[PDB]
Amino acid sequence: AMAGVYTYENEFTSDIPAPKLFKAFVLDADNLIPKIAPQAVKCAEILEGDGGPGTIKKITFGEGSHYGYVKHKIHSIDKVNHTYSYSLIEGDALSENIEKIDYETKLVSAPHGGTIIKTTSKYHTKGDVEIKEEHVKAGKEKAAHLFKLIEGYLKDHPSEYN
């Protein structure tokens, strides 16, 4: 049975400077996200580990989830370089034919003072590979919205994540 890896890059941009964002979005996601999108994210909970490399998180969704949750395994976190890698491993985007999805995200400092969020997504496939543009671009939008909500919030809370 054919094993393979579908790979998809995209970027977003943001006014928020890289480090604030990293603290908010990566480092306190568990807390900050449910606060600002309770429609779409009920809860977030660490099943195992500190929360560094090797941790397993269950994230629990509200409306607009096929399965109503995911689990993530954190592969790495680099606070100094502002990068993050993990793997979706059980739940929402997966199936018999998509064993796993890997994300790696690099925040980079744009011109001038702002940020560029670079994400690379890696679909570990089994068997024939059908991966619909929809399911993928639908995903882009979800994340794009979510980052927009973070910008907005953080701009309304400048005493935070400094």
Residue numbers in the entry: -1 to 160
What did the study's authors say about this model?
Fra a proteins are members of the pathogenesis-related 10 family and are required for the normal accumulation of flavonoids and the development of color in strawberry fruits. PR-10 proteins belong to the START superfamily. These proteins adopt a helix-grip fold with an internal cavity capable of binding hydrophobic ligands. The data presented here demonstrates that Fra a proteins bind natural flavonoids, providing for the first time mechanistic insight on the function of these proteins in the control of flavonoid biosynthesis.
The refined model contains six molecules of Fra a 1E in the asymmetric unit. None of these molecules contained catechin inside the cavity. However, a molecule of catechin was found at the surface of molecule F between two Fra a 1E subunits in adjacent asymmetric units. The nature of the interaction suggests that this catechin molecule has been captured as a consequence of the crystallization process. As expected, the six molecules in crystal form B show a very similar structure, which is also similar to that of crystal form A. However, a high degree of conformational variation is observed in the loop regions L3, L5, and L7. In particular loop L5, shows a distinct conformation in every of the six molecules found in the asymmetric unit. These conformations range from a “closed” conformation, represented by molecule C, in which loop L5 is folded over the central cavity of the protein and approaches the C-terminal α-helix (colored green in Fig. 3b), to an “open” conformation represented by molecule F, in which loop L5 is at a maximal distance from the C-terminal α-helix (colored orange in Fig. 3b). Molecule C in crystal form B of Fra a 1E, is the one that more closely resembles the Fra a 3 catechin complex with loop L5 approaching helix α3. However, in this case, loop L3 adopts an open conformation, and the bend in helix α3 is not present.
